[PDB]
């Protein structure tokens, strides 16, 4: 069966660089240019550059040009694609992929461009059936909990998936919905829990003060 | 040049569907090499049809491509659970030809009826712009299919910078929960009459809106 296996893994601070290996077996290494596309995450496929395995010549995609390089070594079936100065946006699974139709294609190889460290969040009351809310902010790495009133309001609560912002943080929201009847009287407090900085915070939502 | 696919499609089991891939008369329209990859969540992609409309060996011939003018179209009839994906249409790479993919589409296999999203736009906090920032906070929830677009405006104008939105992802219910976060200065927030997070959910666009002041 053809296999292409790739390096693992890595993390790269921004200004670094990457190599990534993919090795051919089960057909003859030479028969085939090794296609090169990268994917940032829940973005879509993009073509970096191809290389013929016989002489080792090479075309790059006009968007990496100057800083991506790609090599070969026959003598051990491998393929190699070195991309330099990485910025945070170069964060993708990088891959190779069989001949000029890509049909196959290597598992490929995760790499997160980071200088991101462990850091607690921010948190903010998001005001006010109605929607009230905590927005917690810039924390890394994940997981953020969040509870209402220490565990006490379970029904309506939404505690949404975190974004994985560009500056290599993650921010959440977590979202109640209650009888727009009792925002008057009941409190409300979120109790946001950031294990991996060792903090908790506890924040009032209070409602929008009519005038 | 930049191949055009749907953002998402969707059909019921049973049912056929097809994806349409358009480029121009130069590419898509002079060569017989546009190509169709399969690729399931935290998988590599599988070519299912290349130059055009032939399989590899072993892809179901519920698989099939064509091309008219300056577009290609991948079909998959009798829709299997297994069908739900996405897809992406591409062109040979390699000698001569520099290689270029579609933005990809998601199929979904249609297992509940569809659903909008419930949208909620917060404003920056008092406390937060007091710290001297801004984070304006759309929450979309409960839709299906799991495929939106998520656009902002200042006034009328639309703004990208300062944009972090997440892919959807599966809810407890299996609808889908998303969320755009807009970071601007405090003085952005106070100098325009207004921020809009814009929805588009098969074809149906909503729009929030909140402003600094009552008046």
């Known amino acids: 069966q053809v296999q292409l296996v790739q390096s693992g893994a890595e993390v790269k601070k921004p200004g670094a660089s990457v190599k990534v290996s993919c090795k051919a077996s089960?057909?003859?290494?030479?028969?085939?240019?090794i296609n090169w596309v990268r994917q940032a995450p829940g973005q879509g496929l993009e073509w970096m550059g191809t290389?013929?395995?016989?002489?080792?010549?090479?075309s790059y995609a006009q968007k990496f040009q100057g800083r991506v390089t790609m090599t070969r070594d026959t003598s051990i079936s491998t393929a190699y694609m070195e991309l330099s100065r990485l910025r945070s946006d170069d964060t993708a699974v990088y891959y190779c992929?069989?001949?000029?139709?890509?049909?196959?294609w290597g598992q490929g190889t995760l790499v997160t461009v980071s200088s991101a460290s462990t850091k607690g969040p921010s948190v903010f009351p998001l005001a006010p059936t109605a929607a009230l809310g905590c927005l917690v902010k810039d924390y890394f790495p994940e997981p953020v909990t969040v509870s209402w009133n220490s565990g006490a309001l379970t029904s309506g609560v939404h505690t949404f998936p975190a974004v994985l912002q560009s500056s290599g943080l993650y921010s959440l929201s977590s979202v109640v919905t209650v009888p727009s009847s009792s925002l008057g009287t009941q409190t409300y407090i979120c109790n946001v829990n950031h294990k991996p900085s060792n903090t908790k915070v506890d924040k009032k939502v209070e409602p929008k003060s009519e005038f | 040049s930049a191949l055009t696919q749907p953002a998402s499609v969707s059909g019921s089991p049973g049912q056929s569907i097809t994806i349409s891939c358009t480029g121009t008369?130069?590419?898509?329209?002079?060569?017989?090499?546009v190509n169709w990859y399969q690729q399931h969540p935290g998988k590599a992609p599988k070519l299912m049809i290349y130059?055009?409309?032939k399989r590899p060996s072993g892809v179901s011939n519920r698989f099939s491509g064509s091309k008219s003018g300056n577009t290609a179209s991948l079909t998959i009839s009798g829709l299997q659970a297994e069908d739900e994906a996405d897809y992406y249409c591409?062109?040979?790479?390699?000698?001569?030809?520099?290689?270029?993919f579609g933005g990809g589409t998601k199929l979904t296999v249609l297992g509940q009826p569809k659903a909008a999203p419930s949208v909620t736009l917060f404003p920056p906090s008092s406390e937060e712009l007091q710290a001297n920032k801004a984070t304006l906070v759309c929450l979309i929830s409960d839709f299906y299919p799991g495929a939106v677009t998520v656009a902002w405006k200042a006034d009328s104008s639309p703004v990208k910078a300062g944009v972090e939105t997440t892919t959807p992802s599966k809810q407890s219910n299996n609808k889908y929960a998303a969320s755009s976060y807009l970071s601007l200065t405090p003085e952005q927030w106070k100098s325009h009459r207004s921020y809009s997070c814009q929805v588009t959910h098969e074809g149906s666009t909503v729009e929030k809106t909140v402003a600094p002041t009552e008046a």
């Open positions: 992929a069989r001949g000029g139709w890509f049909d196959y």
């Open positions: 089960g057909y003859t290494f030479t028969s085939s240019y």
């Open positions: 290389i013929n395995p016989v002489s080792g010549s090479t």
């Open positions: 008369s130069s590419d898509v329209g002079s060569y017989n090499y």
């Open positions: 130059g055009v409309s």
């Open positions: 591409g062109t040979f790479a390699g000698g001569s030809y520099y290689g270029v």
